[PDB]
Amino acid sequence: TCQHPEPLACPVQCVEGCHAHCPPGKILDELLQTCVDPEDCPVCEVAGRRFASGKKVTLNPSDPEHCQICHCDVVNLTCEACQEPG
Amino acid sequence: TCQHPEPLACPVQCVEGCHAHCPPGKILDELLQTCVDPEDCPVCEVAGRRFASGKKVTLNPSDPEHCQICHCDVVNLTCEACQEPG
């Protein structure tokens, strides 16, 4: 989905219920109930690598000197500065 | 003195006691009990201006961008780098 573009660990094979079926070239987002083209997803790709659609997590806690954080809210190709402990 | 080369605010005019009197061209230091020539004082003059004999104070707290600190322990013509807050 636009919210979960990546595949997830899938404990359940399939499930009942209402399922939005529309032709390809369109990915489902729940807020705008219909399916929509992929580009309309608020998807995030900062410094190249593939990941989720801008999860709200502060990556890289481990190393202070390598504290090179890059959040993404919806679309922004931004990177934030780390506050030094010293 | 070598420790207090500058004149100080002097609440008392004069005082009793033992007083080291020796000819001029020699300034008193208390550690080496006698008076000694001025150059032997661990005196400090960093970037030109006249001040004490290297007081152990971190000058210039006010402005971060102008944080241009210059300590002097005894003799060194050194200046230390300020740690940035960002």
Architecture category of domain A1-40 in CATH: Ribbon (2.10)
Specify whether the CB–CB gap between B48 and B42 falls below 8 A. no
Strands (E), chain B: 27-28, 35-36
Residue A57 CA to residue A34 CA, distance in Å, equals 28
Residue B37 CA to residue B41 CA, distance in Å, equals 8
Residue A66 CA to residue A59 CA, distance in Å, equals 11
What is the structure's resolution, reported in angstroms to one decimal? 4.4
One-letter amino acid for residue B40 of the chain:
D
Query: How close, in Å, is residue B83 to chain A by CA atoms?
Result: 8
Nearest residue in B to A81, CA atom: B86
Residue A73 CA to residue A79 CA, distance in Å, equals 11
Of B48, B52, B71, B50, the C-alpha closest to B2 is B52
Of B35, B49, B45, the C-alpha closest to B1 is B35
User: Which residues of chain B lie closer than 8 angstroms to A83, CB-CB?
Assistant: 86
